[PDB]
């Protein structure tokens, strides 16, 4: 959610802001439905005031003919639930509006269409030369027995996967080793979250009322009819951020920095023809997720900290990448500044996402009424949050098994993951 | 599913074994409906031959009018349509009876009318006598800031948690160390499954038709609105058994031992009341499954190998038990025969369920098609399954938590644990 004071006082600068994004701000109907919000706002506040006037003169008058005065008091109040019915009409006709808005993008960030319009900032190690052909993950995982997609096809349906044996154990190993180097090394606590969340907590996050498309939904309970409307989380980020919902933080104990192994629960829209064959697009998938909480004016100097969290993960595996700055047009709707890492992936001979760190501004504290406040300070102020894969677990076994597979299809263990498979160097 | 034939040859026999866990067979019902069927079988059949036989007499007499005679074979076309729709009609009928029918206790089963009429087995080690008042594992989460039911029902509803901290890092070391001992010690393959599973899947295990109200089921998606009817998993023995589904596996193969570390999530009918605070009963809840497909001669000496591994969870991190033969009125709908293992739970004064292992014999076999054959043999037969749980990972954390509690709260690591909590003696 944007200031609504500054889509007040700065609309056609917002406009401005937002259009390099390729979003077109309706500053038109804002304004027409602001200026008849005024009008039906003091009609009902004038009649919000005589009704609870004309009551005052009933529970004076039973003391000293009290139905003249409750007929008047009943017509009244008849009104003013229809003038406020009218009012809550408007008000959710502007809300549609105003959290259909994406973020503000930083200044920082490079004017773009697209993610052909994305700048590379820095590149780490050197992609693998291969001394035969190489094998994706798929042929990999169908040598080893391992990565059964026609199980998972008769388990449930497409764009799920069945892991079996010692690439189910490394797939466990790497979400192993990710939570441990952030709890460890990073300063992260570690969290055990719900999989399954509520309207209020997507629409704190942003995922609502924009994407509910993007989510597997589920049917209400029957012994829980009318409060288990719920969604399967598409990311840590969604439970993990509403944690600091309804707060006030005492700013000494800011930053806020949380970890969560979960799977992930996606049916992004018109993915069809992309990625059809194997882990990259899944609707389910594991991700180690970094959350932080942090102070305004340190929001800028979390995001270089914690996607240099991320880039360890990749750098102690040995996997090369890429860090890529992405334009005002590829960013995420919730983000003012994204940085995606992109693993080497030798059998696309291409680098692809694994990870993508955000600074979501002001933007979700906004919606959850996340607030800060030094101990003697007479005001509090919106939190700023921050998250981050480190990493994708999927994609870092897609990675790992193809940039260290053997020319007879053997999987070479990372030296950091050896600890988390017993001192095994290779599978197979 | 119960063998058809043996619902044919002995009915009543059948009715009698059926009685011990309290459920009433319908043999009348059944057969009124059986005599019905095979009088619209042989009318529908007459139909399939005298249509086929017409059919040929057309493409015959197109080479030496076609007209009076494709006129005929549209007439019969309808008619047998008619036939087999009405026939259809009938046998989704006998299916409805036919699939709610639970399994046949085995003679090993004691007979009783619910839980106070289960027969204790055994028992193993000595509940710890306390020179304090003992805390429940809520009072104990609270103090440590590490189980934040609140924080659950704000990101979702009730019967969920937040596990924050060194508590979840707690929670993550159950896990991977129950895992560690199946994989390593006990002959059991490590497996990554999808949490959301189709109806064939859950008529697979049982979960279907009989208990769709115990399930979370998802909404159709837009992109794949007639193959995305699912359900999350109450249980990895779902994904798991249905590995077998329409496969003949070579008796050399036999046993299959898989595992699995999943989430369960479950809206089990009115559990309103009972275990209203903390860990015990939860929507969702992490759980190590154990699944044995083996050849039918073996499943009865499979299911105390089983039972001893769920055991030794147990045993290796010190937590007294008893272990428990469940009678006729107390077993799951599929099993044949199960035995709970039940924790000692200070703040509760008594033994709480954690583990039910079970000999499902051919029931699911039988409704997923899984067979097995000696390379010899000119017939196939029927497999066994068998599940059980190794263990229920909040109900774990649930017992550590409580017996190894310290006066000023303090959790005292397990031995065994302390290698997955980096040698970590406290939490506290
Ligand atoms: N909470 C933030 C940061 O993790 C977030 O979710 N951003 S993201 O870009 O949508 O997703 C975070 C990461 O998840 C992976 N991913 C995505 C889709 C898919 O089908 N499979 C994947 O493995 C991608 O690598 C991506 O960089
Ligand atoms: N597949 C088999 C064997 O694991 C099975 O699911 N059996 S069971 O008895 O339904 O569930 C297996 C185990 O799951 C735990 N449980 C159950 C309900 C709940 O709300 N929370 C829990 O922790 C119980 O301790 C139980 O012994
Ligand atoms: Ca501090
Ligand atoms: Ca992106
Ligand atoms: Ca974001
Ligand atoms: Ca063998
Ligand atoms: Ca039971
Ligand atoms: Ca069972």
Redesign the interface.
Known sequence: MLDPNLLRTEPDAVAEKLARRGFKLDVDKLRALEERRKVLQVQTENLQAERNSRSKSIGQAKARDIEPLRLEVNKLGEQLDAAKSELETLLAEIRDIALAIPNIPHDDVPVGRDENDNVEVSRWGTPRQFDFEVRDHVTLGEMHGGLDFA??V?????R???????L??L??ALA?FM?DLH??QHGY??????????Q??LYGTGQLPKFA?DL????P????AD??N?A?IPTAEV?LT??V??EIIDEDDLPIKMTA?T?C?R?E?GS?GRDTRGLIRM??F?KVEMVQIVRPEDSMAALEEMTGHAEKVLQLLGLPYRKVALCTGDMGFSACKTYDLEVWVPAQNTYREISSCSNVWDFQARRMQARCRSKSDKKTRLVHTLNGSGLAVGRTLVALMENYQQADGRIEIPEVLRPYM?GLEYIG
Chains 1, 2 share one sequence.
């Open positions: 199980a998972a008769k388990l449930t349906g497409s799920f996967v069945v892991m079996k044996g010692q189910a154990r797939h466990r192993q939570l709890t460890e606590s570690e969290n055990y979250v719900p999989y399954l969340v509520n209020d907590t498309g597997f939904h589920t049917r309970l029957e012994e829980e409060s288990s719920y399967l439970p509403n944690l919902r309804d192994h799977p629960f049916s829209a069809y609707h389910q594991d017993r």
